[PDB]
Design an enzyme around this catalytic site. Structure first.
Site, PDB file in Angstrom:
ATOM      1  N   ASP A  55     -16.278 -93.575 -54.282  1.00 42.45           N
ATOM      2  CA  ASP A  55     -16.359 -94.324 -55.540  1.00 42.45           C
ATOM      3  C   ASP A  55     -15.530 -93.702 -56.659  1.00 42.45           C
ATOM      4  O   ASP A  55     -15.674 -94.082 -57.821  1.00 42.45           O
ATOM      5  CB  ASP A  55     -17.820 -94.475 -55.991  1.00 42.45           C
ATOM      6  N   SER A  56     -14.667 -92.750 -56.324  1.00 48.97           N
ATOM      7  CA  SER A  56     -13.789 -92.168 -57.333  1.00 48.97           C
ATOM      8  C   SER A  56     -12.506 -92.976 -57.421  1.00 48.97           C
ATOM      9  O   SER A  56     -12.106 -93.615 -56.450  1.00 48.97           O
ATOM     10  CB  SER A  56     -13.469 -90.710 -57.012  1.00 48.97           C
TER      11      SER A  56
END
Ligand SMILES: [Mg+2]
Ligand SMILES: [Zn+2]
Ligand SMILES: [Zn+2]
Lengths: 302, 43, 80, 97, 221, 242, 359
Positions: A55-56
């Site tokens: 999710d970065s």
């Protein structure tokens, strides 16, 4: 986005006005009735150094500097008085009791910090003294990020008694820790910001605003995000805006042959170079415009 | 208000004050990825 | 609130042709809209409005980002 | 050798075989509590789109389409019935635990 | 005076009348910086000083009234067409505050005028729209890759003896003709042990009736 | 972090397994022990090397996740779509320029010499020589009929730190993999030595992909017209049975 | 005489007035019938016999590592008392003004923006409303007059003073970026036809980047604001400036290498063995440009080196170059000085060819 069209006339709490908004290249029928909120960010779906995992996301620092997802954040400060006991004014150390230790009282003018000055932590923004000789019932600016006084008024309350109303503004660019999302529900945290020369680029010079992990797709199955990039990639070159409303007839095979009609490849992938080394990847990279939206979850506020 | 009403629930004396604690010298922030840090390092 | 001065992605000076590009758009759209009411233009299902040649005649290159941000940016003057 | 979706699944980085099948081939039968879609719309009808005592498998949660092809309106409703359970059970996996 | 000025400075009507006064130069374009400037702006906008205001009981009767009185009867569709809308809107707002006669009909007339004006403004706000047409037709593309139900022959599931098919035998054909043997038939366990990149998966074979899948139409239905 | 514009707690993605964390907006607490007694206890009892092996399951908690998993496969893969998976001396040296270990010796290499991915991996596993022999996640009997497996990729063998053959993926390097590479390094050299090797092998994998590339596109999910008809035929046979 | 790069192509981006919509819109917006005073220029350059580290470093410097100028507002320039417009905030207008591409001659020019809206309609503020209030009078414009700076509601105002020319590099703030990338390719590597469906997942080059070593490149960059009558003078200048910048930065490292007897925080020397020497050079605020140049030329000079690497860490703001070689410290420093001299000579030849090619 534009949270309200009458924002300058309002004194709201925790409200963000994003300056720039775009109609999606692949819009829906919902945008006939509400204003779109977001930008058509160029997104590369690639592994770049491992800073986009879990999710970065990797953001272009130049995209941030130019105003992408930038705006102004607002806070209010409403302070009421007691009838003829309390009053607004600058306290004086000689006759006033319990002034705040290590607090700045020098920015006050007639009890209120004037509009246009920068207030930092430990500053008195509203001067308020109660008479018994005086007790310092003042309000201090307790925030670690500085603000600017945007609007000061002294309106009359329901009981026809004066209270102090202050509006504080925050110039909020996108920064590390802020949350963005696509319209398919893929939300991410801005992890790394790279300069222009460090971002990857295609043979034709196209570079992404965002780099998202390809590993966000296979378990989430947000296929409408991948189709949107494929359609919008040909929309930009053709100069058009199409409709991508749910349950409208689509054919990914024909939408992919539409890319080759416009001079791109069938898959929408391009030859790409590493911005840091100048070397080309051995695999063509899927890069194209995907509508992304900044979620109002600010790391400076959390 | 009563003396024994302070005890029972999750917001009561025993669970909020005795079995847990508000503390000083502590920080909180959103977490982010960094591949240059070791596994036993925090940025 | 306006078309950006430069492209958000690459920084090409998109804005110097923005105003012209805006007004030309209206004329072009006035040629193709037909009898449909303006607010129903994004609902016509028979329109094919292509701005490619107009942006090319402005001198703007064939970059995806630049034409995306030129075409899609909302103008606050048109909504307020 | 080149497909990135297959390599993420085959190596174990992310995804499973049913994920690729759902995206590319078909979703199949929607099962809730090891059952098909129960007739909940007025005595023998699962939705307003299917008749009463319908015999076809589509009326009881069989999604024939994949995600790439797109789902019809009844298939999206049955998909939302299954996906609402995931959200409900995730909220319950915190409190009940 | 000070409490009345603070009360009225927070009135949106005051801001609207001050804007109208600034447009035609009745008050300076900047906000007052001195008490004299504030007093002058209040006198011009409200029509009377704060002291003569509370003296008495009228408030709306003398609020600014724009100087240029354009002809709003060209708002009958027949710089302009936007100055007229603005000035007539302010004038009708002032008439509303004064409960003027025949206000309700003039309001509907101006509502129709400004609905036409908003139609124009919605034309100006259009960014374009495109529909991908099917070349075979001449309208929006209805071609999809959705599933189409089709009753297949029953021989696709059963053989001429009433038994179901078991497609568990894999038939591999040599890519190059010189490769020997031409074909190899293996199950899933022995694919890695007997088949290399010199072969391609041709067809599946049934393990019960021993028919190729593509040759299943040769069964007598 | 000396940059004044960073407000986030940053950590390695392989450390997220300890906390069940990800980067969608999770917030975490941090406090620094100021007392001497608590500082001693922090580094002797509570250091994260003490929770490399799970108390719950008695297996490793950390490993490669999502980028050094597919990245390790690509690095140790025998053949690239462009021939043998080899790299010259300059690009082999560039894989180690980020691992923050002691660089290997490349003195016995001409600039035009070609090094395969298993030789580069072995240059890192010589420091903690373990023994490993399992089939990788890459080989599945489900995929075997419809794809040609390279016989050098489906048998992962490590002998005293030398990757003799096979690819590295979730079975060998993945997080939570019992009997894996880092579980074996922990059992012979300690959980702190295993954490160092997870980082070092992660940098090899990430530095390989930063030249090889990895992407996903819409066309990766699209069947051919002939394959779409074959899928329709299968579903029609299901509805025929129904 | 090494002709490293030849065959430069310079082509401005111009407005096509043949299109009637564009012609009419320009005419009744800005009374515009000719080209704008400043036009974007696309420059395509062919380099031969040079590593891609040098060409890509030149590209990176021309993108966001070359000193450039922008317009900014001095503190207190935005007049709160005089700007009565509620929508044109200082953040918005400052961001708009920062990114107007200028072609300035000196940092003395000071501009102002004094907009009044005495009408019942919204009034748009353009760049032609930026009046010069200080500095020598301009004989040629430094920006185009067709930028929509803002818009004022009826009866509103916008007064901004102290608009000045500010200097910086685009690596810090993107308003100092100079060149946008339009093309990059290698001319000595063959390419597949990638329109075919068996090649479209690959980059296209027939050699893997893990093995290839191209020496013949084509690089195309676009400069956003160049005066029409002096295009050849501007582009040439830009190119030469970039070369000097690189040389200067390289020369900075040459100051470290010649003080290796003196203890220096930016250079650490180890004797790992009786025959093996290690050098670690840590430079603050350095980027992949210099690190890659240094690694490439040290590798060219010492083909059988034990190790060389140039880790630039984003959260450390540091370039750290590690060199391990089987010589002594003096021999290693001599080799490193030779590598730096090779870099300097390469970019001096680049300056010479820039002067030779562009008339
Ligand atoms: Mg989370
Ligand atoms: Zn652009
Ligand atoms: Zn059979």
């Amino acid at each position: 986005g534009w949270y309200c069209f009458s924002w300058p006339y309002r004194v709201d709490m925790n409200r963000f006005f994003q300056f720039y908004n775009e109609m999606p290249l692949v819009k829906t029928i919902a945008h006939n009735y509400v204003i779109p909120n977001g930008l058509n960010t160029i997104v590369a779906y690639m592994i770049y150094g491992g800073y986009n995992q879990e999710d970065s996301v990797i953001v272009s620092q130049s995209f941030i500097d130019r105003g992408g997802f930038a705006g102004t954040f607002y806070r209010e400060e409403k302070v009421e008085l007691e009838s003829d006991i309390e009053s607004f004014g600058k306290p004086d150390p000689l006759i006033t009791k319990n002034l705040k230790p290590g607090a700045n009282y020098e920015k006050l003018v007639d009890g209120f910090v004037p509009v246009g000055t920068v207030v930092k932590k430990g500053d008195i923004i509203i001067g308020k003294v109660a008479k018994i000789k005086y007790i310092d019932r003042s309000v201090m600016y307790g925030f670690d990020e500085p603000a600017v006084v945007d609007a000061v008024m002294r309106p009359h309350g329901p009981n026809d008694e004066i209270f102090g109303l202050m509006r504080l503004r925050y110039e909020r660019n996108l920064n590390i820790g802020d949350k963005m999302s696509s319209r398919s529900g893929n939300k991410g945290i801005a992890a790394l910001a790279l300069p222009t020369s460090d971002m990857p680029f295609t043979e034709d010079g196209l570079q992404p605003d965002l780099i998202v992990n390809p590993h966000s797709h296979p378990s989430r199955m947000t296929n409408g995000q991948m189709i949107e990039t494929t359609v919008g990639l040909a929309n930009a070159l053709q100069g058009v805006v199409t409709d991508g409303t749910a349950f409208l007839p689509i054919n990914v095979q024909l939408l992919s042959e539409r890319l080759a009609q416009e001079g791109l490849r069938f898959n929408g992938c391009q030859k790409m170079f590493n911005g840091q080394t100048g070397e080309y990847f051995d695999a063509a990279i899927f890069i194209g415009p995907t509508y992304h939206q900044r979620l109002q979850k600010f790391v400076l506020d959390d | 208000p009563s003396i024994m009403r302070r005890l029972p629930r999750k917001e009561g004396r025993i669970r909020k004050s005795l079995l847990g604690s508000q503390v000083w010298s502590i920080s909180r922030s959103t977490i982010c990825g960094n591949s240059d840090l070791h596994l036993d390092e925090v940025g | 609130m306006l078309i950006p001065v430069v492209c958000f992605t690459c920084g090409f000076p998109i804005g110097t042709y923005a105003a012209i590009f805006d007004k030309a758009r209206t004329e072009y759209i006035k040629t193709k809209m037909g009898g449909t009411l303006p607010q129903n233009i994004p609902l016509d299902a028979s329109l094919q409005i292509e701005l490619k040649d107009l942006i090319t005649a402005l001198g703007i290159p064939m970059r995806v980002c630049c034409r995306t941000h030129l075409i899609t940016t909302l103008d606050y003057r048109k909504y307020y | 050798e080149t497909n990135g979706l297959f390599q993420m699944v085959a190596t174990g980085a992310k995804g499973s075989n049913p994920n690729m099948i759902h995206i590319m081939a078909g979703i199949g039968q929607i099962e809730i509590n090891t059952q098909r879609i129960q007739p909940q719309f007025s005595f023998g009808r699962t939705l307003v789109y299917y008749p009463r005592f319908a015999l076809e498998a589509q009326a009881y949660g069989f999604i024939c389409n994949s995600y790439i092809a797109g789902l019809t309106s009844p298939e999206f409703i049955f998909g939302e019935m299954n996906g609402r359970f995931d959200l409900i059970n995730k909220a319950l996996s915190t409190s009940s635990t | 005076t000070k409490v009345l000025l603070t009360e009225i400075l927070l009135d949106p009507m005051y801001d609207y009348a001050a804007t109208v006064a600034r447009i035609d130069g009745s008050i300076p374009m900047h906000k007052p910086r001195t008490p004299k400037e504030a007093e002058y702006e209040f006198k011009t906008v409200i029509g009377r000083t704060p002291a003569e205001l509370l003296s008495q009981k009228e408030f709306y009767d003398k609020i600014y009234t724009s100087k240029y009185r354009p002809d709003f009867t060209q708002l009958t569709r027949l710089e302009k067409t936007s100055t007229l809308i603005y000035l007539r809107a302010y004038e009708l707002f002032l008439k509303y505050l004064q409960n003027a006669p025949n206000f309700n009909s003039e309001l509907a007339e101006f509502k129709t005028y400004e609905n036409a004006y908003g139609e124009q403004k919605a034309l100006l706000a259009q960014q374009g729209f495109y529909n991908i047409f099917d070349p075979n037709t001449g309208r929006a593309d209805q071609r999809t890759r959705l599933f189409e139900y089709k009753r297949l022959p029953i021989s696709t599931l059963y053989d001429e003896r009433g038994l179901p098919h078991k497609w568990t035998i894999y038939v591999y054909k040599a890519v190059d003709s010189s490769q020997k043997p031409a074909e190899i038939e293996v199950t899933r366990k022995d694919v890695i042990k007997k088949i290399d990149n010199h072969y391609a998966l041709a067809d599946l074979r049934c393990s019960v009736c021993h028919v190729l899948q593509h040759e299943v139409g040769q069964l007598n239905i | 972090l000396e940059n004044p514009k960073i407000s986030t707690f940053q950590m390695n993605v392989s450390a997220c397994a300890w906390y069940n964390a990800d980067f969608d907006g999770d917030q975490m607490n941090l406090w620094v022990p100021w007392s001497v007694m608590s500082r001693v206890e922090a580094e002797l009892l509570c250091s994260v090397r003490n929770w490399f092996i799970s108390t719950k399951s008695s297996g490793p908690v950390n490993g490669q996740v999502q980028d050094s998993t597919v990245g390790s496969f690509l690095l140790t893969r025998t053949n690239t779509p462009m021939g043998k998976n080899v790299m010259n001396k300059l690009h082999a040296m560039g894989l180690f320029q980020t691992t923050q270990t002691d660089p290997p010796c490349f003195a016995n290499y001409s600039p035009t010499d070609l090094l395969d991915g298993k030789s580069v991996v072995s240059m890192l596993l010589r420091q903690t020589p373990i023994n490993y022999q399992r089939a990788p996640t890459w080989y599945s009997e489900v995929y075997a009929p419809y794809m040609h497996y390279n016989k050098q990729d489906i048998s992962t063998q490590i002998r005293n730190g030398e990757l003799i053959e096979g690819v590295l993926d979730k079975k060998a390097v993945g997080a939570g993999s019992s009997g894996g590479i880092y579980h074996l390094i922990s059992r012979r050299y300690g959980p702190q030595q295993a954490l160092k090797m997870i980082f070092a092998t992660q940098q090899l994998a990430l530095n390989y992909v930063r030249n090889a590339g990895f992407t996903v596109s819409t066309a990766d999910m699209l069947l051919t017209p002939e394959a779409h008809q074959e899928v329709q035929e299968i579903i029609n046979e299901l509805l025929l049975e129904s | 005489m090494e002709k490293i790069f030849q065959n430069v192509e310079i082509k401005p981006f111009l407005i096509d007035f043949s299109n009637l919509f564009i012609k009419n819109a320009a005419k009744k917006l800005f009374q515009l019938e000719e080209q704008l005073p400043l036009v974007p220029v696309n420059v395509v350059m062919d380099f031969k016999g040079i590593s891609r580290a040098a060409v890509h470093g030149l590209s990176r410097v021309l993108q966001d590592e070359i000193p450039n100028y922008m317009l900014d507002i001095k503190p207190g320039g935005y007049k709160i008392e005089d700007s009565t417009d509620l929508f044109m905030t200082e953040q918005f207008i400052r961001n708009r003004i920062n990114f107007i591409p200028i072609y300035a001659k000196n940092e003395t020019l000071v501009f102002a923006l004094r907009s009044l809206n005495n009408s019942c309609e919204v009034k748009t503020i353009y760049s032609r409303d930026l009046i010069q209030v200080a500095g020598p009078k301009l004989k040629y414009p430094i920006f185009n007059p067709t930028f929509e700076i803002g818009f004022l509601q009826p009866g509103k105002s916008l007064i901004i003073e102290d608009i000045y020319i500010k200097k910086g590099i685009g690596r810090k703030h993107a308003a100092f970026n100079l060149a946008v990338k339009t093309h990059f390719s290698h001319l000595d590597i063959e390419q597949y036809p990638t329109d075919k469906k068996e090649y479209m997942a690959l980059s296209g080059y027939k050699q893997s980047s893990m093995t290839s070593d191209p020496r013949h490149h084509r690089l195309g960059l676009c400069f956003p604001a160049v005066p029409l009558p002096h295009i050849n003078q501007a582009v040439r200048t830009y190119l030469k400036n970039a070369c000097r910048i690189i040389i200067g930065r390289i020369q900075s490292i040459q100051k470290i290498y010649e003080n290796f007897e003196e203890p220096q925080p930016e250079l650490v020397l180890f004797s790992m063995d009786e025959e093996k020497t290690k050098a670690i050079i840590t430079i603050k605020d350095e980027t992949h440009t210099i690190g890659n140049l240094l690694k490439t030329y040290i590798y060219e000079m010492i083909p059988d080196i034990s190790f060389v690497g140039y880790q630039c860490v984003p959260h450390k703001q540091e370039m750290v170059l590690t060199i391990i070689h089987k010589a002594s410290q003096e021999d290693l420093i001599t080799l490193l000085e030779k590598s730096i001299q090779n870099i300097i000579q390469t970019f001096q030849i680049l300056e010479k060819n820039v002067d030779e090619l562009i008339a």
